[PDB]
Structure formats: C-alpha cells, structure tokens
C-alpha cells in the first residue's frame, strides 16, 4: 500500500523554530485526469481528540489558523511556517483518500 | 561520459573585468562580544584562523544587449561567462598571532628531567601559548568547498560501553564555509564534541572542527568544479615536548619493560604531546597578489561557471598579528599603577579581487538540452527552454470578502522567493554585479595580460 | 458509541449515533486504535451502501447502515483479538472545488 | 525525435536477437550434499542446526551466475562495437549429471492417524479409543522433472483462505480453501500424492502424514500459469515423468464432523448401529525403477521453445530446477556404545540416518548481441527496465550521462561499522527467497574439445573442423 | 609476471596523533584529573591508481627455454602445462565435498594451491573488478593523454 | 598501527588472457600469450600534514652531557626517566614484482 | 566560562589571556641585498613611462 511516511522519530523546534517534518506517499502524486493533489493529515494532542490537520495544502480548515502552510506537489511535500507555535507541538498523522483503503503516516510527533 | 566543456563550447572574443573596492575587515582574536545576559553579539571574534571563503555575485550577461547584438540569436543559444583571469588584492604587511591556553593539561617536559616528577595535584592546568603550521593557500573553482575531517564512530551494540570508554572513530566529509577552523594539525574534528576535558587546547581551537581540503574527492568530482584550482603551501615542525596529566585510558604491558620501585615504582607519563615550531617567514614565500592564470585544468570545466556565480577561497597564516590597547580609565594620576589598564583586541584584515573573464555562447541540442539537464538542470531552470507547457485555464472571483459572511480567508503566497538551497549555510558573500567594464587600460592589472596578450594596444 | 469489554472469539455488536443532524447526508466509517501511534483502520460503506472493504475485512466486518436511528452499526463474529483496539466512528462530507479533503466530525469512539 | 511510434505484443526473441559464431562451455566439478531425511538436527537448546535435513524428497533450486559478457574475452571480438550494442548469453544446451546408484528410500511416522484396514475386513472393528496412532512407513510416488528458464519456477499449492464472514467459525469447522501461487524455494517438498497444500495449518493432528512433509507445504508446478507468461521467461522448457499405484485401504480415526445422512443407507443395529469412519485414504506406492525412464545423463537440444523467449537468459542469470526420486535410498549405520560385551545388546547401538546427494551441471552457451534503437530500448524497458540498469543503457543520452558519481571512503574502514555493518544495497529482489547457489564465472572455456559433453555438440552438428 | 605487483611506501610526515578525552562523570562542575580517561588513535590515508600497458609474447624454444630458466612457476599459470604445444596437466582435477555443514569440512585437507609466501603476512587489496577502458573518465589518466597529447573526440 | 609501521601493498591483476578487447583479432591467443605492463603510478595521500612523536617512560640515562657545573652524582639503581623524542624524517617509494628485500 | 571548566586553589583564578610574540630578525646575507646594483626600466604598471 502506501502507509504514509514520517521517520526517523526524534526532532524538535525550540522557542522560535519552524518545524521539520516530511510525509511521503509511496505512489506518484502527479495524477492524470483529476490533477489536484489528495493529502490528509491529523493532530493528536493531550486533552482532546486526535484531529485532522490539512486538506489539499492550499485550502485550510476554519478553526485552523493559517500557521500551517505547506509546499510541493507529488510524493513528498515541504511545509513552511512564518512562526511555529506551541499547539504546533503535536503528532502529525498523514493520509490520502483517492484509492482507499485509508492508511496512515509514519507520523510527525514534532 | 562527461566531455570537456570546450567540446561544445563556443567562445567569444570578448572580455570584461571587475575588481572589488577592496577588503575592509577586522575583529577580535579570541571570542566574539555580546551582552552578558544576552546572546546578542556586540562584536565578532575575527581571526585568520577563521576559514577564508568568499563568493561571487554577478549579472546575467544576457541581460546586457549590445551595441552590436547582431552576431547571434539570443534564443537559439545562451551566452555564458568564462573566467579568463584572476587576481587577489592581499595588502597587509605580514604578521604573527600566537596562542595557547591559560589552563592546560600538562604533566611536563619529556626531554629534560633530572629525576622523575613529583606527585600530581589535581587540576594542575597551566598557561602557555604556541605557534602554528606556517601556511598560505588559495582555492579556485565553482562548486562548494567541502572539508573532510574526523568523527567519532558509531558504537554498534556488541560491546556494552562503559562509563568513559573510547569513542569509536570516524572521518567526516563535509561542506566548507568561511570563518571555520584552521588546524595546527591538532586533528580535523571537534574536541568540543570529541574531548571531555575542555582544558586541553587553545580556546579558539577548543571551539570547532579543524578543516582541511579534500582534493581527492574534490579531485573526485565528476566534473571537478568544486574547484578547478587552488594552491597549497606551508612550513613547520615541532618546538618542544610535553606530557599531559590525566586519568588513565589504558596501560602498557609489562613484558614490554622492567620494573622500578619506590620512586621508580610509579608510572611515567604515557601522555606525550609535542610542542610545535612554526618557522620563519619571507617575502619570497609570498604567493599572493600576482597575476593568476589558467587555461587547461584537470577538469572538463575551463572557466565553466554558473548562476553568474562562483566560490572563492584562500587562507594565509602570514599576517596573523593583532594589536591590543591599553585602556586607562584614569589618566589623572601621574604615578604608575597596573590598576588603570584594560586591554582589548581585534584582528584587522584586508584583501581585494580583480578578475578577468570571457563569455561564451551555447547553441541547443538534446545533448545541450539534456547532457547538462542530465548533468544538472538547474541552469535551464534559469533558462526558459525547460518546457513545461502546462494546463489550467479557469477559476472564479466571488467578491467581496469583507462582507463578513465568510468565504474561506486567504492567500499565503510569497511563498518561494527561496532559491539558494544551501542558503542556510552561512558565510561570506560578495555581489559584484555592475562592476564590469571593458578596458584594462583602465583596469589596474590584467592589462598585465593585455601585455601578456600584447596586441597593439590600439590608437589615439 | 457504546464500545467496551469484549472477549475475543465471539461476535461484536456496536453502534455509532448521530448527534442533532441529518444522518443520510454524507459518508460514514468505523475506526480502531493500535497503540504504537501506528493507527489501523476498520470499516466503511457508501452512501448507496456499497461495502468499503480493504484487503482485510472484505465480507468480514459485517455492517448495517441505519439512517432512521441516525446510528451506524457493525457486526463481527469469531472475533480477531488482533482487532483489539479502541474503536472509533467517522463520517464523510463533500467540499467541492480544490479537490482535497477536510473533515467535519466522527463518533464517540 | 520523440519517443517512438511502438505497442507490447510479445515477439519471437529471434526477431531482434542476432546469433553469433562462437560457443563456450563451463561446468562445475561436482556437487555433494549430505543430511538427515526426516528432520534437520540442531543443538537441542540452540536454534542453530548441527545437521541439516536432506532428502531427494526436497526440491532443489540452482542459481547460476554468468559474468557480464561485455567485460569478457574472445579470440575475435571485431564483430561489434560496445557503443551501439550489448552482448548477452544464450543457452543452447544443458546437462544434468547424476552419479548415485539408483534406489529407493522410504519415510514414515511413528504415530500415524489410522483406524483399521478396510482393504479386507472380516468383522466389525472396535470402537474409537484414545490414541490408536501407529508407526508405519510408505513409499512416495516416483518422479522426475527438469526445469529451465531465466525466471524463478512458480509453484502452487492449496491453502487455508480467509473465510468470507457471515457465520462465526466455531472451533471444529472446515476452513475454506484457497489455491495459492508462490515462488518455489529450495528445500521445499515434493508432493506425496496427498496434494499440494499446507498440512500444518489445515491439519491439526500432525500425525496424518510422515515427518518429512508434516510441517512443510508440498507444492506442485502449474504448467498453465507458467506457460501463461507472455515472455515465457519463467521457463522456456522442461520435461516430466512420474508414476504411482494404490497399495492399502485405511481410515482416519477421529470424530466425524460431517455425518452421513441415512437416506444413503439403512439404519443398522448392534455393531452396525454405529457408523465406522467414512474417512478413507489410500496408501501411495511407487513402482519398480528402470534405467530407461531416466531423464538424466543425456544431452538436450533446444532450438524452438514454446515461449517467445528462445534460450535467452537475462541478467547474466539462469535457473535450473530438478526433482528426482530414483536415488532416494537412505543408508543406515550403527555405532556401538560398548565394543566390549560379546552378547548382543540392543542397548549398545546408536542408530543413525544420513542421505547422499550428487549433482553436476554442464552447460552450453551461444553468444548474442543486441542492436539498439528506441523501439529496442522501448520494448525492453517495457518488458523489464532493470536489465537496462545493470546495463549502461549503451547510453542514457548519446554521450554517457553520469550521476555525480560514487567515489567511496569505504573499502576497508575504521571499525565503527555503520560504516559497514551494512554492505550491499540495491537487492537481489528475491533475496528473501532462499535457495542453492553456485558460481561458474571463472569456469568458461573457449575450447569444447576438452570436454565430454562438448564434442557431442560438435558431433551432433558435426565439427566441420574447428575454426573460430 | 604472474598478474602480480608490489608497492611499498613509508612516510613520516603525517605522524600526527590526535588525543581525546572521555568523561566518566558528566555532572560535577569541579575539575578533577579523575573524571577523564585518555585514548590515542592515529589516522591513515592511502590511495592507489595504476596505469597499465598491454603486451604479447611470441613463442619459440629459445623463448620457452629462456623463461623456464628464469622462473618456471610462471609457465604453470599459462597453458604449456608441458614444455611445448599440446596443453596442460592430465591427472584428475576438480572435487568438492560439502555443501551444508556436518561432515569433515572441505578444508579439512590443506589448500594445495599456493603463493608460497603465504607464510609471509602483509596488507592486501584486490583490484580484479575495477578496470576501465576509457581514461577520459578519470582524474589521473587524462594527464597521460596530456603527456602524449592526442585529443580529438566525438560530440 | 602507526605511521612508522612499514606498509606493504599486494595487488592482484586478473589474467589478461581471460579478458578480451573491443577488437581481439590482431593476435592468435593460442600461439602466444598476453601480459600486463605498468607504465605509470600514483600515490595519493590526503591527511593534513603533521608530525607525531614517541617516547618511553623508563629510559637508561645518566644526565646531561652538554653542560655540567660539577661532577655527576653516584649511580643509584634505576635512574631511568620518562623522555621522548622525534624520529628521523623520511620518505620512500618502492615498486617491483618481487618482494622488497630487507636486511638488519 | 563554557569555554573552559572552573579551576580551584592555584587554579581558583584565571591568569591574563593576553599574549604577544617577540619578533626575531634572521640571518642576514650579502645576497638578499637589493642595492648597489643597477636597475633598468622600460615598462611599468602605470601609464607613465619614466615621466617626471
């Protein structure tokens, strides 16, 4: 399949540090007829439920501050954040829905 | 199957030059200045021992169109500088810095003792300074310099490691930057990583990783473009012989020796370190500031240069002298006391560069459109014939947002001014762009070549 | 919604209830919890009720969609203790231009 | 300009391939193997084998490497330019040497799930006890086969499939079955006539069969699928012979879980009130061996093969699979714990089982070259691209594009050893799959005369004289 | 001869010995000679690149004689098992007795073939695989060209 | 290991006469043979250059002979001391088909 | 401090950090003398040729 890919496990971003995480599908993400990337994500914190991060990387959820804005198309992507903050501290799951089943990131705990 | 550049290369007849203002540079020998509570630096520690590396920023030639544009199509080709020639200004009279550490692990001399030493007080550290390997160098080429240097190896899980054990061992091979650590030959590496003591060395050399070229792998580039050139020179040897004093890593098998007793019962230092002697200097040893030349090089690159962009590096011991100040916070009293004098230091630094160049022109075939695309495509990124016809006509305006009912609120998109990938690497930078001009009649030097040329000098 | 103690080998009967909304409007699924932080996935079925099954549970997890009770259900039997997990419900939606997928809600888990 | 106009069909490889004037030979000296028939011997606490399990009943895989021809010596190479062309081996003819005295082994199990002998029964048998299993042995069906191709042999077997889930499986219930293809691995077991499947999963008794196959999965090759390959590269050739006959008539002893409806019969009474086990199984038997049936020790000649692949071995790589029951004899020796006493004591001897194995290979090859165009490159790339990679692509552009190459710090490093502990990357993509290995790459000869087999190649084609 | 070549070289210049310290206790903030063991390791760096030329030999008696005088072991590795043309050596040649491991191993007999100096140990490298036919691709070789010039080439 | 250790490099070549060429017709492999010849050679050495050193903790020694104000003391037992020195600087290179012959 | 470790006793305090060399002239030779020998000019880096 594609079990989405975030490894090796230990990295971190101190006071004023943009975050480094990379999730990469194992199938080509330039696709023929549709031509809009499909990518899913999540955030698992202490105190409430694990919850989606980002959808289509250029369209963000409301109730999601713009602080997470990623780049790239295709298998691997590049995130950029003007200022990373606390609740950015989180486990970041990653996923794609076009060809089901739904499989999960090796995960960003950054 | 790389080929020479000049296989395909198409020359110009035509040349420009620039040379810097010069170099204004100074700063402190030992460590940089900052507010004590703070991390914000007042003033840089600056040293020769900081690796000496500078890099090139230049206009696209294709930008300038010509009094005679005729001779070529800008489209069916591209138009690409070559370096014809080079010169560094290096101006200081030559100088001696020197150093060591106020605390030092040492037992003592090796050579001279009438008797075995006495007992060891703990923390016997002492203050001594030393000289260095006596050296210049120059480094010339277009791809990043990369130093290779020791590392601590990877302990595998076989031996369970015990507190204080030997770090396994490595050579690390890694990008060069400016302002990095010369060796005296104390090993190319960081004790700060790889030495617990922190009392072992000159402060400065405590800091960071000694670094040294890898010709070989720079020799080993497929294209040899890290540098196509450099020169390398030095002199030195040892001055004295001195023992460290520290807790035992390991000991010598007895069979190798005999046994003493009493006074002689006890172990003479296996910690053995020399004290180096760097040598005299001379004018003639100067390699600097002289017409500097190539045509053929070891690599296919001949003056083959990209991003209008090149890397320059050199190093010299010779000038290492600083000078300090005696600061009298009171001038009033006329009778002497050591009281009144604080001391400060900086190391002043100076250079210039004047360099000769050519342009060349490049038509287009797959090879062209590929071999380098193959080789690296980054330039045809910079060119426009990388193609890429896209899809994607239409969208929807929707306006306006400010209405306070909510359509998703929007765009983030400066996003990628980012072009230098290696930009996080941080080091000196020199933009040259508009310093170019025609005639060395006007340009103090390479008319040297123009005479090396000769050619008739043209009338008035 | 209601999941709890189950000893493996039997059958497993669970529910996912809607909360104050139209139930037939959008897609629905079941989920589980595999503690590595490496998550495992359970079940789905279409709006038209076509069985969404992976290489694993095709015909296995036996689902019953109920729009009326506004509750999602699932049947299992001869349980796989490898299916031991904190099970989660999830739902679908539609958001229609940019073509990448946000998510509004999911069940009690 | 542009990629080409070109489809996939298959083609007879002789389309593009060119046949050369030259032939070579190499062969191993010989190969021996020894081990225990019934199970491998290991140190009892240890998992490491002291002794391997070896019998003719196990399959044998042979991987044979060739050197890159484009590195290789000839008396006359004029005929080609490496610029425009490859060279690739072609295998014209093949031998299997087998030297052992031919004879039958045997196998059995000390507790065999068994009820009684139904071949003849004079009276109603007893009632199911506890543990009536017995010590009995049998002969397996006799078999010979051979297999040749540049892709691994694909076997198949029965297996337990994931049941489609409506009814909950109660312990006791028939698991559904699934036919499963797989790569054939060395040491795998010939069928006994009991079917290619997994006893371990589907049979919990573990006493149903003799040892050798009990834990393992007997497999059998499917000519269909194998031949169904478009490129036929699994195998371009084979041969097969086998035979078996019935011997005895027994039952399984156990609870009945599919009971027999009465309508098939009438209800009995007394001893006939209870239905005896309707499980029956035959006793498989091989017959008398003959020198004639031997498929071995004789040369073979391949020119036209069913697959469009004609003797083409891609990736300097060639396979052979061999199965023989005729040499199966297991020798038994005894060693005496006391050489003193003059009275025979059972207690004095330690009985032992070992089995011999003899292999050899003698291989003929033709050399062949490939002219390159896009269509060429295309088709292959389509077929398999990897070959092109081990290959230099003759070129990536037209002058030799290179990747900012490899020059290394390694070959003998400093003993930290993530500087190697990890040697060779890439893969043999089958590296997971285990099977026997040999290297011939030093063994070639430019003169066939010297060899027993070779002259036949001459002889069969005539020598004319031997030039070039 | 014998596909064999020797190089021996020694340098004094690189003799530098780096010395590092490991701390058995990282906590205490007061300096003590106790906390630090000492170890000494020394770096070594070599490389080899060798040009080669290719040559042939005609055979006559005087030929064969003259060599056989010099070192006769040489002839072994060629053909001419026997002084003249015929070929090679006619007792039986090859045998292997193992595969997997029970029996007295294949190496229970000694290794018959020898470099007789096998008694003499020293550092080893194998090149067998590494040859290339085109100098252009290597740093060193093009100088060889340069020394002899001889340039032209395709596009 | 130390620099002062001699180095010995043995290098094997594959038999030419197993290995062919783009064009081999120019010779008969039967009547003749092929042998490598060595035209030119290089030695790469990459370390930053610098001198090491050795010593001994116990060494037979009396005292300085260079300058002495008064006559020396009485010889005790084991006056050995810890002293070190630098070795003679040297470079060499050796090439041939037969092992280097030493003497002592 | 982080550039070293606290001393004590004799090492309680830090000695002055400063250092400066003592320059030493070398063997003088008759050769390196640049004088008492004629000079000849034709071309100079400047455009002046011996114009005063």
Author numbering:
A (entry chain B): 1 to 30, 30A, 30B, 30C, 30D, 30E, 30F, 31 to 104
B (entry chain D): 20 to 479
C (entry chain A): 7 to 82, 82A, 82B, 82C, 83 to 100, 100A, 100B, 100C, ...
D (entry chain C): 12 to 479
E (entry chain H): 325 to 479
F (entry chain H): 65 to 168
G (entry chain E): 273 to 324
Please give sentences taken from the publication describing this entry.
The infectious HPV16 has a T = 7 icosahedral capsid (55 to 60 nm in diameter) comprised of 72 L1 protein pentamers. The apical surface of each capsomer is comprised of the antigenic loops (BC, DE, EF, FG and HI loops from each L1 protein) that connect eight antiparallel beta strands (BIDG and CHEF). An extension of the L1 C-terminus, or C-terminal arm, links capsomers together and provides stability due to the formation of disulfide bonds between 175.CYS and 428.CYS from two neighboring L1 proteins. First generated from mice in 1996, H16.V5 (V5) and H16.U4 (U4) are two distinctive monoclonal antibodies reactive to surface conformational epitopes on the intact HPV16 VLP.
Here we present the near-atomic resolution structures of HPV-V5 and HPV-U4 complexes at 4.7 Å and 5.8 Å resolutions, respectively. Since U4 Fab only bound in the canyon around the pentavalent capsomers, the asymmetric unit for HPV-U4 included six L1 proteins and one U4 Fab. U4 Fab was built with the heavy chain relative to the light chain (heavy chain followed by the light chain) around the five-fold vertex in a counterclockwise direction. The U4 Fab was observed only in the canyon between hexavalent and pentavalent capsomers with most of its body inside of the inter-capsomeric space. Specifically the U4 epitope was comprised of residues from the C-terminal arm of a hexavalent L1 protein (431.HIS and 437.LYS) located adjacent to a pentavalent capsomer and three residues from the EF loop (180.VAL, 179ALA, 176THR) of the pentavalent L1 at the edge of the capsomer crown. The C-terminal arm from one hexavalent protein and the EF loop from a pentavalent L1 protein contributed to the binding with U4, which bridged the two neighboring proteins. Two of the five residues in the epitope of U4 overlapped with the known heparin binding site. The mass axis of L1 proteins in pentavalent and hexavalent capsomers in the HPV and the HPV-U4 Fab complex maps indicated negligible rotational and translational movements of L1 protein as a rigid body after U4 binding. The distance between Fabs in the HPV-U4 complex was 96 Å between two neighboring U4 Fabs bound around the pentavalent capsomer, whereas the angle between two neighboring Fabs was 45°. Thus, even though the geometry of binding might allow intact U4 antibody to crosslink capsids, we propose that direct interference with receptor binding and blocking the accessibility of the canyon are the main neutralization mechanisms for U4.
